[PDB]
Structures are given as C-alpha cells and as structure tokens.
Amino acid sequence: MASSKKVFEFKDDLNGSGKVLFSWSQDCSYIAVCGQSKVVYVLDKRGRKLKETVLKSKNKVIGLEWDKDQEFLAILQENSTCFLLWNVFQNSFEQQDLEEKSKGSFIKWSKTHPVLVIGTEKGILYFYNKKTQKKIPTMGKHSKKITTGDWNDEGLLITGSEEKVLTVSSHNSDSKGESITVQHEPSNLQWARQKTDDRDSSQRTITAILSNKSILMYDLNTKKQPLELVYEPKYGKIVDYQLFGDGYIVTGFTEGYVAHVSSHLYELRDEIQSKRIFQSSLDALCTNDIIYKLAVAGENQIHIYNLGTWEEVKSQRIELPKAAGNVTKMQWANNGQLLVVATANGHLYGYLTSIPFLTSTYGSIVSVLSSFTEVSIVD
C-alpha cells in the first residue's frame, strides 16, 4: 500500500497569493505554474526548478496554456492589452498586440491543434495560426464580454459570453451552427461522449454549467435542443462537475452534496444517485479514469473515493494545513502520474499516486520497478 506521497511544497513567494494556474505538459513531464507574482516557472514531477520567466505586467494571469509541441506557452493577464508567447526551452519572448487596444479576457490553445483562440470584452474573436503566425478575425459572434471557451479533441471551438449564448467554430474559422440560446448563462465548457449503444460516437457533446446552478447538455446527432439538468434546492450553488467513463457526470455542490448521473439521455431527466460527502464546506472535486480515482478536497482535507461501488477509500487520505484554505484548482496529469493542488492563497502541493511500474518477464522470472531509484527482480 503506497499512500499519496507529498512530493514537494511550493508557496506564494514565487507564485503570489491569488488564483494560481498550473498547466500540464502534453507528456506529463513538465508542470508550468504561475500565480499573481508575475513569475512563471516550470517544475518536474519530483519538484526541481527547470525554467523560470518574468512577465512585464502585474495583472492576474487569466490564461496560461501550453502548445501541442510542448514548446510555447501562451499567457494572457487580467485586462491585458497584449498577450505573450514564451518559448520555455529557448526562454524566448514574443508579444502579440490585441486589436483596437482591447482588454484580453480569454485565450485557449487547441489540445489537438496548434491553434490559439483569443477573445476580448468587445466580442471580437481572433483565431491565431502558429505555423504561419496569422490572424483571422470574426465580428459579432458575441455582443458582450467572452466568459468561457475551449477547444474540442476534433478541433472544434466552443465559446460562451455573458449574454447567455454559445457559438461553435471550426478550423477555417467557419461557424458550425448558429448561436445557442438557453434560459441562462452557460459556463465551464467541456466535451462528453454521451452514453450511446453504438460505439461510433465522436467527442462532440457539450457539457456546461448553467448560471452556476444547473448543467447544460447539447448534442449534435439529431439536433436536440440543449437540455437543462436542474438540481434540488438542497444542493445549493454548484462548485464543480467532472466527467468520467464514457459519459458519466459526477457533480459536487457547496454543502458536500454529490450527484452521479449517467449521460444516457433517457436517464438524464432523473438523477441516478445522490450522496452527502461533507457537512461544513467543499473546495474541489475531480475524477480520473486511467487511475480510476476520485479526489475530493474540503476543510483542508483531501479524501479518495471509488466511482463504481462508491466506496470511501480512506487509505489514500492526505491532509492539508489550515493555511491552504479553500482549494481553487486541483487536478491530475493526462496519465494521472502526479496530482497538483493550488488554492487562492498561492499554496502549491504535489502528490504522487499511481506511477505504474514497468514489468518485463523472461522464463518464469519477472521484474517490478517499485521505487524509481531501484528495480526488484522477482522469482
């Protein structure tokens, strides 16, 4: 039994007390971290400083995302007039100016394509191609400030402003569908593969947070209207929702209330199950499929849970000090190799969970990596 080892601790002296953004490398080999202290630095899995860089402005970084090639990081600060592309291994700077002296509000790479989408308060949306470093502008897609947005695995942009609309964009900046009109504000855009009997479903389902109270569903197979999964008043205000499996949603609320619903459309109307986790407050919650683990942070304490049987895994419990406060971001890697915890106080924590050991066998002899500093041969 290997409990979650505390690999390293980092504080706000190099990040700054605020909303700390940590971004994973595409190969889970580099962890870039930046908070409010205008310093962006990358650490390894064991907690060694690799590359550090300084930003000219002191505004809070609202966007910090790697590229597909693990070469460039795009950074946009709070109401910044421009944005910065930083080459980590070259430690090089390039600055791209926002048109019309616009204040930046949203930037995002594509997790599958080297394309960077940028949007400001005026609703002007620019698509940036890195291979040619060219700009494609789009007018009037949003009549107000852009609030949420992201890129699909297939290369599809989703964007949502404060006027309660959703828009879809393609590689050639062609809109894929008209504006999506729903009762209230959509936020926290994410992609889901709905539970379809046929296993030929693409990654296109749009799952969002509706006005910090409900869940928004959108599908494209038969042009069904976006459905609003509402929650009982006992739930309160939503804190986070997470996708696990092939379309299964686990959502947590303010009073330690959790709800698991299968993304099956016939079963979406009624919650599949609901439970109570905490009785004082809740900070964060996320699920991982490769390691198949649920981590729930609250009261400066992180608990581990199963997803199928929902058994409370108390063995892998880890405790945080009172200085951590309310956790604001908490996430595994792409493969779940390491777990990173960041709060609004600038505290950074790293935990080792899985490290699946390699194993090769000769005749009747096998091997186990065990600790990374040695290898145990097994008879």
Notes on the structure:
This is WD40 repeat protein. It comes from Tetrahymena thermophila (strain SB210). It is found in: Cell projection, Cilium. The structure is cut from a larger assembly and holds one chain. The protein is mainly beta and 379 residues long. Helices cover 2% and strands 47% of the residues. The protein has helices at residues 12-15, 265-268; strands at 5-10, 21-24, 31-34, 39-43, 49-54, 61-66, 72-77, 82-87, 92-97, 104-109, 115-120, 125-129, 134-138, 146-151, 157-161, 165-169, 180-181, 186-192, 205-210, 214-218, 227-229, 238-244, 248-253, 257-262, 273-276, 284-288, 293-298, 301-305, 312-319, 327-332, 338-343, 348-352, 366-368, 376-378. A four-stranded antiparallel β-sheet has the order 1-32-31-30. Strand 11 (115-120) and strand 12 form a beta hairpin. The longest helix has 4 residues, at 12-15.
Task: List the topology elements.
Blueprint lengths: L4 E6 L1 H4 L5 E4 L6 E4 L4 E5 L5 E6 L6 E6 L5 E6 L4 E6 L4 E6 L6 E6 L5 E6 L4 E5 L4 E5 L7 E6 L5 E5 L3 E5 L10 E2 L4 E7 L12 E6 L3 E5 L8 E3 L8 E7 L3 E6 L3 E6 L2 H4 L4 E4 L7 E5 L4 E6 L2 E5 L6 E8 L7 E6 L5 E6 L4 E5 L13 E3 L7 E3 L1
Antiparallel strand pairs: 1-32, 2-3, 3-4, 4-5, 6-7, 7-8, 8-9, 10-11, 11-12, 12-13, 14-15, 15-16, 16-17, 18-19, 19-20, 20-21, 22-23, 23-24, 24-25, 26-27, 27-28, 28-29, 30-31, 31-32, 33-34
- Between the first and last Cα atoms, what is the distance in angstroms? 21 Å
Oligomeric form: part of a larger assembly
Which class do the helix and strand fractions yield?
A: mainly beta
Largest sheet: 4 strands, antiparallel
Main-sheet strand order equals 1-32-31-30
User: What count of helical segments does DSSP give?
Assistant: 2
PDB class: protein transport
Keywords: intraflagellar transport complex, protein transport
Entry title: head module state 1 of Tetrahymena IFT-A
Name: WD40 repeat protein
